[PDB]
């Protein structure tokens, strides 16, 4: 009856030698991680980049998300502080306990119950698709728009700085920010041009991920087309991906391999080419993501 968590995706804790270059490291872990779609990377313990966003002027209007909008078939400005105050108040009121005491398995189980619930309409807000050009990237950048301390220059030049990832494909982009709260989510989808993606959680409560390897991409799309609303069945992928929310247990019951992970603060998540992925936030957090080429 209740949610059965998918198996855990691979977690890598590279040494300082293996942490020298991201593309080299991702290429060596590819034989395993591409069989799970997503993977988690924990940097060395002393690798702690400072949060470099202009928090004094950071303002945004988040988007409203109704969890059961598909089942039921049916805009305030915040600062970073005011959104976090709303986010913590929502979670502590909903679970009747401090936000840091709510188990991740409980938020996960309750999230998927609310998505399919008809008698309970839960509505959250998500600060999504905030460009790193608006208020700066979460990573220090030698832009000249903000001071970089000597202890922060190694992070401004690091290859794991998402602003330093290669983004140009060989033929004949900047990171985006996401301010999450409890139950704010993103549905199943693949990146444009089947591109890689790397995600870094700067701070806050964990972000729960679900991933499907690329070898099962067609199987997921077939299951989606079979069970998604018939009114959205003939929609193109770029538009259907806006409303492709589906319980992972439903995919697993149809033979789709699904892996999960809890991305905690200071940890990376890499999605491989054509790896369908979805997830939700356990609470107030801040993430940065960019597509990169190999």
Ligand X SMILES: O=C(O)CCNc1cc(N2CCCN(C(=O)CO)CC2)nc(-c2ccccn2)n1
Site for ligand X, residues 219 to 258, rule: CB under 6 A? 241-242
Closest contact distance (angstroms) between CB of 24 and ligand X is 25
Q: Answer yes or no whether residue 124 interacts with ligand X by CB under 6 A.
A: no
Contacts of 273 by beta carbon, 8 Å cutoff, 6+ apart: 34, 191, 194, 195, 196, 214
Say if residues 111 and 206 touch (Cβ distance below 8 Å).
Answer: no
From the list 200, 272, 274, the residue with the least C-alpha distance to 237 is 274
Helix (H, G, I), strand (E, B) or coil at 162: helix
Q: Is 126 annotated as a binding residue?
A: yes
Q: Answer yes or no whether residue 182 interacts with ligand X by CB under 6 A.
A: no
DSSP string covering 99-143: GGGS-HHHHHHHHHHHHS-SS---EEEEEEEEEHHHH--SS--TT
Q: Is 132 annotated as a binding residue?
A: no
Helix (H, G, I), strand (E, B) or coil at 178: strand
Q: Answer yes or no whether residue 83 interacts with ligand X by CB under 6 A.
A: no
Q: Is 191 annotated as a binding residue?
A: yes
Q: Can you read off the two tokens belonging to residue 157?
A: 């030049």
Closest contact distance (angstroms) between CB of 59 and ligand X is 18
Q: Answer yes or no whether residue 128 interacts with ligand X by CB under 6 A.
A: yes
Q: Answer yes or no whether residue 86 interacts with ligand X by CB under 6 A.
A: no
Q: Is 142 annotated as a binding residue?
A: no
Q: Answer yes or no whether residue 289 interacts with ligand X by CB under 6 A.
A: yes
A 10 A CB-CB count for 12 gives 18
Residue 85 or residue 129: which is nearer to ligand X going by CB? Answer: 129
Q: Is 253 annotated as a binding residue?
A: no
Q: Is 199 annotated as a binding residue?
A: yes
Residues annotated as binding site for Fe cation? 189, 191, 277
Per the annotation, where are the binding residues? 126, 189, 191, 197, 199, 207, 277
| Residues of each annotated binding site for 2-oxoglutarate | 126, 197, 199, 207
């Amino acid at each position: 009856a209740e949610f059965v968590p998918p198996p855990e995706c691979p977690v890598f804790e590279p040494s300082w030698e293996e942490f020298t270059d991201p593309l080299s490291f991702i290429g060596r872990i590819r034989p395993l991680a591409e069989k799970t779609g997503i993977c988690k990377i924990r940097p060395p313990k002393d690798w702690q980049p400072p949060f470099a966003c202009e928090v004094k002027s950071f303002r945004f209007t988040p988007r409203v998300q109704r969890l059961n909008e598909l089942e039921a078939m049916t805009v305030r400005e915040y600062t970073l502080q005011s959104f976090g105050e709303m986010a913590d108040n929502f979670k502590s009121d909903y679970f009747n306990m401090p936000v840091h005491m709510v188990p991740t398995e409980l938020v996960e189980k309750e999230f998927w119950r609310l998505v399919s619930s008809i008698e309970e309409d839960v509505i959250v807000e998500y600060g999504a698709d905030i460009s790193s050009k608006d208020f700066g990237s979460g990573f220090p950048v030698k832009d000249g728009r903000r001071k970089i301390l000597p202890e922060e220059e190694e992070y401004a030049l690091s290859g794991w700085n998402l602003n330093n990832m290669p983004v140009l494909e060989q033929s004949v982009k900047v990171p985006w920010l996401y301010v999450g709260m409890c139950f704010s989510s993103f549905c199943w989808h693949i990146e444009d041009h089947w591109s890689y993606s790397i995600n870094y959680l700067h701070w806050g409560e964990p972000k729960t991920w679900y991933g499907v390897p690329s070898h099962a991409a067609e199987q997921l799309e077939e299951v989606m087309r079979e069970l998604a609303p018939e009114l959205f069945e003939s929609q193109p992928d770029l538009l259907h991906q806006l409303v492709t929310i589906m319980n992972p247990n439903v995919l697993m019951e149809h033979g789709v391999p699904v892996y999960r992970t809890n991305q905690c603060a200071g940890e990376f998540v890499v999605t491989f080419p054509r790896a369908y992925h979805s997830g939700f936030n356990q609470g107030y957090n801040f993430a940065e993501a960019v597509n990169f080429c190999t």
